[PDB]
Design a protein around this ligand. Structure first.
Ligand SMILES: N#Cc1ccc2c(Oc3ccc(F)cc3OCCn3ccc(=O)[nH]c3=O)cc(F)cc2c1
Lengths: 396, 534
């Protein structure tokens, strides 16, 4: 019931970010929600002496009820660094469930001197009236300081459960609580329900770096060997002993692409050695908590997407392939949004922080539509690659 | 006296490390001095300012043009930052049976200033011949030209208008600076009654109120049933300068929101990199543009107001040379507004990408104006968009739309095969160039024995790699497989441009269009892959 003092970083003024336009239904929903929050003392209207602003929009989570989401990215990077080792056993557990404990922050009041930095604006249509300005009087969801402050309280709330079931790992990131166990799916499901009721009083299955595979054919054409040499040449940047001279010697001459070329013994030996090399993991691949994580995403088509998480080029920490088929066949942007969310979730589970995405989409398209399919409470950083990658089929 | 309702002040602080401005006073003529003395005497009698003692060390200059002109320049450089941008667009306004304009008078002086900040607004009137101490004053209300006055007045006006608006949902009030615009569908007598109730409710807080259609507002003409822009004056000068071209472009851009078909590409190209106010002839294409635009601006064009019960529609047309035009309407032949989109600065592009960018722009503009995304009518077949987005390496999306058959239609001019072609000749191409002498070669070899190598001068490695592919397209049949080692050339062709700024790329595209099936494969260079005859 006593606020903890919070300050910003030296030489950095509060956040002043442009509020982007919203549709009429989202504006209505934000008006109603913010009115209810105002009647509960969670937020309060402010005057023009507050120059700071943080973007806010409306989302529908996994259900029909609207939800208020605030893009606290600029505030988080401007909020002072606040002073827990990442539970490396969380990614080694059989099953992990994600819970939303955002309703617990709204009990702890926020520092009086810091509230002016949490200001946000509900925009109006056609600029006919000035926006509705609010500031947070309690701990705000999405702000990185909210879990850092509530850490002590949450530690107390979960102390009995942890002693009761010491095999269950509990991690916290933003407004989300990750609960892992190696129990049977049904056993862990009921146990998660037990943790839920314990919280009321006061589906993930962790995934490797997928290997590089080469086709196995009885007869190879010129085109097959050309693609093979190109894929092995690309893989030679990642693996030391990849050689393609005996396979390139088969392509000697000017033959039609559909013509079948029989493989020689040197070529099958070289190909076999390349296979054995690829079956081994990558040499000297470590994680650096002082470096950012980079996530690249490629569109393969037919709802299939590939992704690679790394820090240094050709040193992948994680690879995967997202191919969910739930109500997104027609919209590529929706699939990309859900794919970005899943990759971010896995990154939060493994390393405890979000990566920086390189999205295969024009900036204008993404900026226009990404909020329409966003269900997460956090927001990662992203950039846009407008040059087509050639390694597209080399990860497929 | 009936006491007017109290208006709570807004606390103001100066920027950190700064304090109240202490600027000396400039010499003024005796006429200016007497006028400022009389003005400040009347203002002090009205309670807007107050005589101050010498303890206050902060002062700000003041001139006279009578009208007093106090300069708060350094105080604005010392005052903190405030909130508050864009103006309401007439196409988003909703048709009302009655619309009243009320201009608040003595508006800033009606709102009090923060008492702990009045000491920093002090000014000195220079006495005659400077034989006496200058008269000293401080502002007790919002000064004219101050940084914080518009925001504080806006916030106060909102807090005052809120209860009357909540009590009268049958009227809609728009608030813009020193003006209020009240619209209602009630009867004229009930409307005027609620206007009198409004100005009485404003008079309770001490706000004085008094125009009629057509309204000349922010370069617009607002009529009861229509809206348009104020007459645009396009200057006629045989000799033009860069400042002139920029002003002409801005006027044309303004008129383009209602006048369809406005093109500014040729004139915009003239001001490329000048950055100099004084400098420009008109190319034959440009003279047409200004003459086309002069023809477009010759006839009257009016827009209508927005009806929420009707669907919102936007139709797009391709103008050529990277130019696009759109009309936003609800009923046929009655536009809410119009607009245009110019392609971004790039070396390669195609129609579908530009059409997508235009859709994104119209979508954002629509969400700003009407708060909703409109249905689109696009000159592109459903099959074309289908093939495009399914084979595009980038994720792309267009909201709900339908195909309108108004040529020119956006189409896909060529499509690369996904697999090699049986029975098609295989052209292994390659090109190289010397870095010092700028000499190079480009050629091909095929499986049937067809060969060609062409000597080239004043060329680059990339130009030769493209030239080799161009040669392979020229001498091949309707179906052809092509092998290259140029990641550059493959990267260009896989972007699928229908036009380029490079003549060689354009010729390659023209060759691609004439083909039936084309398979473009890639192999690593200098790996000893046969056929790659570097
Ligand atoms: N000077 C000036 C001026 C006058 C009215 C304005 C206005 O007016 C309106 C104010 C409130 C409202 F609900 C609806 C309005 O206009 C709806 C459309 N419209 C417009 C004019 C008319 O004569 N009849 C009509 O239907 C809205 C607005 F942004 C700016 C305005 C600026």
């Amino acid at each position: 019931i006593e606020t903890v003092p919070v300050k910003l970083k030296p030489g950095m003024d509060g956040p002043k970010v442009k509020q982007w336009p919203l549709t009429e239904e989202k504006i209505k929903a934000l008006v109603e929600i913010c009115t209810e929050m105002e009647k509960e003392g969670k937020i309060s209207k402010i005057g023009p002496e507050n120059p700071y602003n943080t973007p806010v929009f409306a989302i529908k989570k996994k259900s029909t009820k609207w939800r208020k989401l605030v893009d606290f990215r600029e505030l988080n990077k401007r909020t002072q660094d606040f002073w827990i080792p990442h539970p490396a056993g969380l990614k080694k557990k059989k099953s992990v469930t994600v819970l939303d404990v955002g309703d617990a922050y709204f009990s702890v009041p926020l520092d009086e001197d810091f509230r002016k930095y949490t200001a946000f604006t509900i925009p109006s249509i056609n600029n006919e009236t000035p926006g509705i300005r609010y500031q947070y009087n309690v701990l705000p969801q999405g702000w990185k300081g909210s879990p850092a402050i509530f850490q002590s309280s949450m530690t107390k709330i979960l102390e009995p459960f942890k002693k009761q079931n010491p095999d269950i790992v509990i991690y916290q990131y933003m407004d989300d609580l990750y609960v892992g166990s190696d129990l049977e799916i049904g056993q862990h499901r009921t146990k998660i329900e037990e943790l839920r009721q314990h919280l009321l009083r006061w589906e993930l299955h962790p995934w490797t770096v997928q290997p590089i595979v080469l086709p196995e054919k009885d007869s190879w054409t010129v085109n097959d060997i050309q693609k093979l040499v190109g894929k092995l040449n690309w893989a030679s940047q990642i693996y030391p002993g990849i050689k393609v001279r005996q396979l390139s010697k088969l392509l000697r001459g000017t033959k039609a692409l559909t013509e079948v070329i029989p493989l020689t013994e040197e070529a099958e030996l070289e190909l076999a050695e390349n296979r054995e090399i690829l079956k081994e993991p990558v040499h000297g691949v470590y994680y650096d908590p002082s470096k950012d994580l980079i996530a690249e995403i490629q569109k393969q088509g037919q709802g299939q997407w590939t992704y690679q998480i790394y820090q240094e080029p050709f040193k992948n920490l994680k690879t995967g392939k997202y191919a969910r088929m739930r109500g997104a066949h027609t919209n590529d942007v929706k699939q990309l949004t859900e794919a970005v969310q899943k990759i971010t979730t896995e990154s939060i589970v493994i390393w405890g922080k979000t990566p920086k995405f390189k999205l295969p989409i024009q900036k204008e398209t993404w900026e226009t539509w990404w909020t329409e399919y966003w269900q997460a409470t956090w927001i990662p950083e992203w950039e846009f690659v407008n040059t087509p990658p050639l390694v597209k089929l080399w990860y497929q | 006296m009936v006491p007017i309702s109290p208006i709570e002040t807004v606390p103001v602080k100066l920027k950190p490390g700064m304090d109240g401005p202490k600027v000396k006073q400039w010499p003024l003529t005796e006429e200016k001095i007497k006028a400022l003395v009389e003005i400040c005497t009347e203002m002090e009698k009205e309670g807007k300012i107050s005589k101050i003692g010498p303890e206050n060390p902060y002062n700000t200059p003041v001139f006279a043009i009578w009208r007093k002109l106090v300069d708060f320049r350094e105080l604005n450089k010392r005052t903190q930052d405030f909130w508050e941008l864009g103006i309401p667009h007439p196409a988003g306004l909703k048709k009302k049976k009655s619309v009243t304009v009320l201009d608040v008078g003595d508006a800033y002086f009606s709102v009090p200033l923060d008492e702990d900040f009045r000491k920093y607004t002090a000014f000195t009137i220079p006495s005659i011949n400077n034989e006496t101490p200058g008269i000293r004053y401080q502002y007790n209300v919002l000064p004219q030209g101050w940084k914080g006055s518009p925001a504080i007045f806006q916030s106060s006006m909102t807090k005052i208008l809120e209860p009357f608006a909540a009590q009268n949902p049958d009227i809609v009030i728009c608030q813009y600076m020193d003006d209020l615009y009240v619209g209602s569908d009630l009867e004229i007598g009930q409307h005027r009654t609620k206007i009198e109730e409004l100005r009485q409710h404003l008079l309770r807080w001490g706000l004085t109120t008094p125009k009629e259609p057509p309204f000349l507002w922010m370069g617009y003409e607002l009529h009861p049933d229509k809206w348009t822009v104020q007459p645009i004056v396009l200057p006629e000068k045989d000799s033009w300068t860069v400042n002139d071209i920029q002003k002409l472009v801005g006027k044309l851009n303004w008129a383009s929101q209602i006048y369809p078909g406005i093109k500014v590409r040729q004139l915009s190209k003239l001001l490329r990199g000048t950055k100099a106010l004084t400098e420009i002839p008109l190319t034959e294409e440009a003279e047409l543009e200004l003459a086309e635009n002069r023809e477009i601006l010759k006839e009257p064009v009016h827009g209508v107001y927005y009806d929420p019960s009707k669907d919102l529609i936007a139709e797009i047309q391709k103008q050529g040379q990277g130019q696009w035009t759109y009309q936003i309407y609800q009923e046929p032949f009655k536009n809410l507004k119009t607009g245009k989109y110019a392609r971004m600065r790039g070396a390669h592009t195609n129609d579908v990408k530009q059409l997508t960018e235009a859709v994104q722009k119209i979508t954002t503009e629509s969400i700003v104006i009407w708060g909703k995304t409109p249905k689109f009518k696009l000159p592109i077949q459903k099959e074309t968009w289908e093939t495009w987005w399914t084979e595009y390496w980038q994720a792309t999306w267009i909201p709900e739309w339908e195909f309108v058959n108004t040529p020119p239609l956006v189409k896909l001019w060529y499509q690369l095969e996904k697999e090699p072609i049986v029975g098609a000749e295989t052209f292994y191409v390659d090109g190289a160039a010397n870095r010092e002498t700028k000499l190079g070669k480009a050629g091909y070899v095929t499986n049937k024995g067809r060969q060609k190598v062409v000597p080239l001068t004043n060329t680059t490695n990339q130009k030769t790699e493209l030239q080799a592919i161009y040669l392979a397209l020229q001498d091949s049949g309707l179906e052809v497989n092509i092998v290259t080692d140029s990641q550059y050339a493959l990267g260009i062709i896989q972007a699928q441009p229908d036009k380029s700024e490079s003549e060689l790329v354009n010729q390659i595209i023209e060759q691609l269009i004439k083909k039936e099936k084309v398979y473009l494969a890639w192999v690593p260079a200098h790996k000893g892959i046969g056929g790659n005859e570097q």
